[PDB]
């Protein structure tokens, strides 16, 4: 038994990135759980955690962070930025993806915080966030 979660955004809310794991292509497996839009690490171990956002002076950002008791509180694990500047004549588009492998304790809380929400292209294809144990 090996845990994996795959969360997609709820497109109804468009002005906030709410994670849901109910659809046919979004799920919790073998122990993953949710807790105020955070993913609760089911067991201490090594996980590959990934997430992607798509966008359609403007600042764009999207970080997957790990919540901690000590010093910085919100410790980011995967972050990426992108500046788009006025001079907008085309249907510009952009996809920040990133995943990695981390050491996590049980009950760890993965959450994602993004700048440029109203530009998000909410879909099972584009905006998502999940992790799997190895």
């Amino acid at each position: 038994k090996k845990p994996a979660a795959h969360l997609i955004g709820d497109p109804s809310k468009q002005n906030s990135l709410l994670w849901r794991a109910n659809t046919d292509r979004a799920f919790l497996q073998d122990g993953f759980s949710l807790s105020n839009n955070s993913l609760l690490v089911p067991t201490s171990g090594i996980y590959f955690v990934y997430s992607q956002v798509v966008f359609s002076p403007l600042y764009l950002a999207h970080e997957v962070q790990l919540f901690s008791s000590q010093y910085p509180f919100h410790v980011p694990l995967l972050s990426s930025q992108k500046m788009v500047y006025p001079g907008l004549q085309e249907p510009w588009l952009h996809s920040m993806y990133h995943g990695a492998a981390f050491q996590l304790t049980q009950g760890d809380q993965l959450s994602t915080h993004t700048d440029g929400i109203p530009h998000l292209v909410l879909s099972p294809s584009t905006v998502f966030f999940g992790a799997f144990a190895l």
Partner: antibody
């Protein structure tokens, strides 16, 4: 083998305070979280919160946030629930339980009784 | 914050009967549901996780099913030690609520 043992339940007057202790043994204490679940006399089960004894990364059922505080002492394989300003609602059996994956309450304690009366 | 709703408050059944209890989720919950049997005064016991996997040491006569919104616990050959209050529980998201429970009185 795995053994959870609550202790310290008893009589508390309304608005009072009481702390419950849960002693662990038979699994490496610091790589598993301790839950606290309660149940009012002959009623359902209610999850209070949990604490990771390694990094103190507690997570509460908000119903008790800033009124209950779960701590732990990995030097003594023990989890703690302190409950402030107790009431009628809060009179119950208080269980501590350590899981397999987080949301699967696997092993339970025997539970301990806090009665809240005058 | 999800609620759960167990179908029979209680039920009488006789040894060997097929006992089936249903629990309905207030929203879709993938398949993250657990089933616990308690007994009197003693602590609950884990019977089923992830909606259908039996737990270590759970008698085969215990079986879990359910899809997304509605779930079901079934016992094939009801023993007398198969008596308690059976709680369902969404393991999907915190605060991991329990249904009301279902009490079983064996006929004799």
């Amino acid at each position: 083998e795995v053994q959870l043992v609550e202790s310290g339940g008893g009589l508390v007057q309304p608005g009072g305070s009481l702390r419950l202790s849960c002693a662990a043994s038979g699994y490496t204490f610091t790589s598993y979280v301790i839950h606290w679940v309660r149940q009012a006399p002959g009623k359902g089960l209610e999850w209070v919160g949990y604490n990771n004894p390694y990094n103190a990364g507690t997570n509460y059922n908000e119903k008790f946030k800033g009124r209950f505080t779960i701590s732990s002492d990995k030097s003594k394989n023990t989890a703690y629930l302190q409950m402030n300003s107790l009431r009628a609602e809060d009179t119950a059996v208080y269980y501590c339980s350590r899981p397999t994956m987080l949301p699967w309450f696997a092993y339970w304690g025997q539970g301990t009784l806090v009665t809240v009366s005058s | 914050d999800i609620q759960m709703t167990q179908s029979p408050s209680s039920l009488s059944a006789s040894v060997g009967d097929r006992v089936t209890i249903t629990c309905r989720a207030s929203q879709a919950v993938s398949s993250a549901v657990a089933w616990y049997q308690q007994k009197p005064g003693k602590a609950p016991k884990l019977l089923i996780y992830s909606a259908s996997h039996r737990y270590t040491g759970v008698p085969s006569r215990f079986s879990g099913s359910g899809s997304g919104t509605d779930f079901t616990l079934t016992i094939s050959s009801l023993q007398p030690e198969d008596f308690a209050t059976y709680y369902c529980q969404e393991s999907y998201s915190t605060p991991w609520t329990f249904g009301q429970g279902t009490k079983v009185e064996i006929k004799r």
